[PDB]
C-alpha cells in the first residue's frame, strides 16, 4: 500500500503560526485528510480545525496551517516540560505523534534614549513587541526596573494592541539613589518564563568635549615579538577636530575574570596632531611577571588604560582597550560550519570557519588540508573557506585536519584544528545515498541559488525514484516545501531557488527520497545542509541629510531630515550626543544583534547531514513520522546538545 | 474508574455493573457475597485466605464503589444508602479483626466515609510494626499488598507525619511487579 507521511518541526511555539506539511507517497487516487491537535497527557481537545485532500494532481501534497492558543490551562506549568499530540487521519489510516512544546511566544527589544543617566533625570524608553517572525504583535507586556542588588522599584503592565507594536513609556530617576548598574527586565503576559533584559548605568557626570581612541596595531600579541605590542592613540574633539594634549597610559594583564596591573608599564607621551603612540616592550612585560616562562603567558589576555588631558588642562577622558589575547597563533580555525557526518564513497564538502584571535572573521587567509598540500583555498568575506575531499567507501570514521598556509608566517604561527567525521548509515547497509551540493557565496535577497541533488543507488531501483521531497527551515518554522520530479537516468537534477527577504539570516534545506527496496523493505535516505545569508534588514530604512551644502550647520539652525524607507512603516527617532557613547557605549541595540538573538533561538543544532535519515531531520530541527513506521528520534530537550570542545 | 481519564469507558455499562452489584449481589445488612470465585485463584492475592474473608471482601467492593461514586451517583440513587449499610457492617465488626491485611483494607474503606477515628484509628496505628509497614506472617507479597491499602488510607486521612517512612520502606523493598500471583500487589502499590 501507499505510505502516508507528516512533517513538522521538532518544537512548537505558543501564540504563533505553525506550518503542517502533509504528504502521501506512492499514492493512487484522492485521499481525504482530517487534522486534529490534542493535549498530552490525556484528552481535553485543544484544536479540532483544518482538513484537506491529498490529490495525485498535486503529487499528494497538502500544506495546512494552524495557530496554538494559550490560556490559564496552558500557562499553568512554568518550570518543567509539557507536550501536545498532533493527529492527522489519512482516509481510514491515522498517523499521530507526540511533540515537544516551547513556551516562548515572541521577542521583546528595549531601546533607551541614553546608555547612562544622572540622578534627577528622565529615562525615555520604547519597547518593541514582535512575534517570532519579527512582525509587530499586540500583546500585554510586564516590565520591571531593578536596582543594582536586584530590587524592583517600578513596574508596568500594558498592551501594545492597535499601537503597531510600540510601547513608549517614561520614568524619572530620584535623587535618592544608589549609583551603579541598573537593569530593565521584561516578559510577555502569556510567557512569564521567557525574560528579556537590557542594562544602563547611573552616575554623577558631565559630558567630555573629546574622545580618545586606543588602537592596537594588531588585536592580539605574539609572545616571541621582540618589539612588543604597539598601541596607537588617537584623540579628537567631538565635532571632529584634532586634540592637543598629553597622555598617561598603563598596561595590565587579565587572567580569567581577575585583572593584574603592571605598574612599571606606565609611560608619558604628548598627544600631537591628534595622535600619540606608546610601545610596551617584551622585556618590560617579562620583568612585570614573576614567572620567567613565556609558555604560561599563552591563554591569558592584556588590557590598556589611558588617561588623556588637554594642554589647556580643563578636561580629561579615560579610555580602555581590553581583551587582547596573548597567543601563539594569529588565527583560530573552527569546523563550526562543517557537518560532522560524511557520505562513504561520495565526495564531501568542508566549510572552514577561520577567525582572528578576538573573534572577528579573518579575510583572505589561505588554508589547506593536512593531507596533500595541493588542495588549498582562501577564505571569503565572512571568514569561510571551501575545501573538499574525494571520499572512499570507508565505514571507519575519517579524521580531517586543516592548517593554514599564509606566507612569511612560521609553522608555530600557523593555526590548525583537528576533528573526526562520522559515516552515514544507510538502511540495512544498502549503500544507497543522497548527496547535496550547493554554491558557497554571501547571499543577498534577489539572487538565485542552484541546488544540486545527486542520487546514488543501483540501477535496478533507480527507475523507482520518480521524485524528491524538499523542505526549507528558516527561523524555527517551515517556510516552503514541495516536490522535484525526476525522469529515469537523471541521477542529477537542478532546482533554482530565488532568495527573498524571508530567508534572512540563515536557513537549512532538507531533502529525501523513499522507495521499497532490498528484499521488499521501505527505505528512507535523507540529506541536509546549512546556508548563511547576509545579515540585513527585511525592509530598508535609511536616514540622510536633506541639505546638500552648508556643511557643519550653526547651533539652533533649521535643517531637513530626509528619511527613505518602506511604505506603511512606523519609525521612531532619538538623537544623542556622541559624548554619552564615549562615556558608555555598552548595550546599544543594532540589527546585527537582533539576528544574533534569532540565531541563538534556533532549534537546529548541526550544519547539515547526520548519522542516518532520522539524524538528518533531528539535527536540522524537523520531525517525521510515516504510516509504515519509520520516524524521527525522540527529543525532549529544547536546547541543543553541547559539543565536547 | 482509572481508565476514564485515558479511554472512553461507556457510562451506561459501568453504572449498570454498579446497579447489578447493589441489587443482586449485596445482602440487606451490607455484606457482598461472591457466587462464582475466579478460575485463576492466584490473581486475588491475600483475598485467597479464607480467614476473615467476608469482612475483607466487603471492604474491597466498598472501596471500588466509592471510587466510582462520582460517575454513578447520578445514575443510581441507592448508591449512598448501599455504602452506609456496608459501612455499618464493617465499623461494627472492625475491632474483632486480627490480620494486618484485613485491618488495612477496612481502614481505607472507613477513611473515605470518615469513620476511622478513635479506637478504630488507634488499632489501625498499632497494627503497624516498625512504623513503616502493615505486615502479616507469610509471603512478603501480601504484606506489600496490605501496606499499599494503608498508604492510601494515610493519604485519605491527610496525616502525612506517618507517610514518609512507609514510602521509604516501599522503595527499599525494590518491588517492580509481575510474576505468578502478583495482580493485586502490583496494581495497588503503584496506585499508592
Ligand atoms: C549603601 O548603598 C550602596 C550603594 O551606593 C550599597 O553598597 C554597595 O553594595 C554593592 C554590592 O551589591 C557593592 O558593589 C558596592 O561597592 C557597595 N557600595 C558602597 C560600599 O559604597 C548598599 O545599599 C549600602 N552600603 C553601605 C556600605 O552602606
Ligand atoms: C501552502 O498553501 C497555501 C495556500 O493558501 C499557498 O499559498 C499560495 O501559494 C501560491 C503559490 O505559491 C501563491 O500564488 C498564492 O498567492 C498563495 N496564497 C496566498 C493567499 O497568498 C502556499 O504557498 C503553500 N505552501 C507550500 C509550502 O506548499
Curated annotation (Swiss-Prot), chain B:
Cystine bridges: 15-72
Effect ascribed to mutating residue 24 to A: No effect on binding of C3d to CR2
Outcome after substituting residue 77 to A: No effect on binding of C3d to CR2. Impaired binding of C3d to CR2
Effect the entry attributes to changing residue 8 to V: In AHUS5; leads to impaired binding to the regulator CD46/MCP and resistance to cleavage by factor I
Result after altering residue 54 to A: No effect on binding of C3d to CR2
Outcome of substituting residue 35 to A: No effect on binding of C3d to CR2
Residues spanning the membrane: none
Superkingdom, natural source: Eukaryota
Subunit structure: Interacts with CFH. Interacts with CR2.
Protein's name in the database: Complement C3d fragment
Organism field: Homo sapiens
Residues of the full protein shown: 1087 to 1278 of 1663
